[PDB]
């Protein structure tokens, strides 16, 4: 931190005690959030922010640099060929992907399958010139469980059928049981704390995203508010930590970059329809849910 303009030893200590330890977080901060640190003037805040942006080279980009930026996005396989294709390769890092659907359509299964897949190195697709092997090494997942449906047994079974070690998935997946929207939001805000403690968080799951909010603000206005702050935190986390963020929506409006509607097909079959994305056509993906997890 002292490399930053105006920042000396004591200011660097204050910054780290407020949780601002990397340049990117400072470069993307508002003067307000830094001045609210006290001991940190408004002029010093504007100076270190400008210095941070410069060290992170955050200005206008054009031509080939536009392609380079896009190449920093890596993708996580879903174990379904069809679903991966419709996704343009797999679940994207630096974006929030939402799976909505009726009860039993497979939302929680996909969340569990993703936690397992993260532990199979060959299921993370990336361009080696834009994403280094070290960036996706020892990846870990965070599962914020709002329903009480996380099942370690299911993790073990899906891992076994994929030929990877179940205990290893459990060891590298943090689960937070949230009973209301305050806990759900605080847990999401605390993921930055796990990352600074050395955990390479690369997958964040929120199952469910809207249940607590609907149960508490059954007030679309405020609800939408609190939910908007929650969504901004998820989108920022995805961008800044080059992380895949997945959320489920139990349906019977907000900022997701990819949105699916999953429905039941015959017995085993499920259909996932991508209905919103910034660059892909609407398309349907047929898959199945079996003891092996998600397949086809
Ligand atoms: N061990 C398993 N073997 C085969 N199918 C399973 C297994 N566990 C769960 N499923 C399937 O997943 C369905 C439930 O999916 P789930 O993810 O919980 O739905 P949602 O979260 O959308 O309400 C089940 O009813 C069952 O068909
Ligand atoms: Mg993004
Ligand atoms: Mg569920
Ligand atoms: Na300095
Ligand atoms: W609603
Ligand atoms: W409602
Ligand atoms: W209603
Ligand atoms: W209504
Ligand atoms: W409503
Ligand atoms: W309505
Ligand atoms: W509804
Ligand atoms: W309704
Ligand atoms: W409703
Ligand atoms: W309605
Ligand atoms: W509605
Ligand atoms: W609609
Ligand atoms: W609409």
Curated annotation (Swiss-Prot):
It holds the Pfam family Rad51. It comes from the Archaea. The keyword Cell membrane does not apply. The keyword ATP-binding applies. GO terms for biological process: DNA recombination; DNA repair. One of its GO terms (molecular function) is damaged DNA binding. ATP binds at residues 101-108. Gene3D superfamilies: 5' to 3' exonuclease, C-terminal subdomain, P-loop containing nucleotide triphosphate hydrolases. Belongs to the eukaryotic RecA-like protein family. Involved in DNA repair and in homologous recombination. Binds and assemble on single-stranded DNA to form a nucleoprotein filament. Hydrolyzes ATP in a ssDNA-dependent manner and promotes DNA strand exchange between homologous DNA molecules. This is DNA repair and recombination protein RadA. The lineage of its organism: Archaea, Methanobacteriati, Methanobacteriota, Methanomada group, Methanococci.
């Amino acid at each position: 931190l002292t490399d930053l303009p105006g920042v000396g030893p004591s200011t660097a200590e204050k910054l780290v005690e407020a949780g601002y330890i990397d340049f990117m977080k400072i470069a993307t901060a508002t003067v307000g959030e830094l001045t609210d640190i006290e001991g940190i003037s408004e002029k010093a805040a504007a100076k270190m922010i400008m210095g941070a942006r410069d060290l992170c080279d955050l200005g206008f980009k054009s031509g080939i640099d536009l392609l380079k930026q896009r190449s920093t996005v890596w993708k996580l396989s879903t174990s379904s060929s069809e679903l991966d294709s419709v996704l343009g390769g797999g679940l994207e890092s630096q974006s929030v992907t939402e799976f909505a659907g009726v009860f039993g359509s497979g939302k929680t299964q996909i969340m569990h399958q993703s936690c397992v897949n993260l532990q199979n190195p060959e299921f993370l697709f990336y361009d080696e010139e834009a994403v280094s092997k070290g960036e996706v090494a020892q990846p870990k997942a965070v599962y914020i469980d709002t329903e009480g449906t996380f099942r370690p047994e299911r993790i073990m079974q899906m891992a076994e059928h994929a030929g990877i070690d179940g205990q290893t998935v459990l060891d590298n997946t943090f689960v937070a049981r949230a009973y209301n929207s305050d806990m759900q939001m605080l847990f999401a805000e605390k993921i930055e704390d796990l990352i600074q403690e050395g955990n390479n968080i690369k997958l964040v799951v929120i199952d469910s995203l809207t249940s607590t909010f609907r149960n508490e603000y059954t007030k679309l206005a405020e609800r939408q508010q609190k939910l908007g702050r929650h969504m901004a935190t998820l989108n920022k986390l995805a961008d800044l930590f080059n992380c895949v963020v997945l959320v489920t929506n139990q349906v019977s409006g907000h900022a997701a970059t990819f949105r699916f509607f999953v429905r039941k097909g015959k017995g085993d079959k499920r259909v996932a329809k991508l209905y919103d994305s910034p660059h892909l056509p609407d398309a349907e993906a047929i898959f199945r849910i079996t003891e092996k997890g998600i397949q086809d």
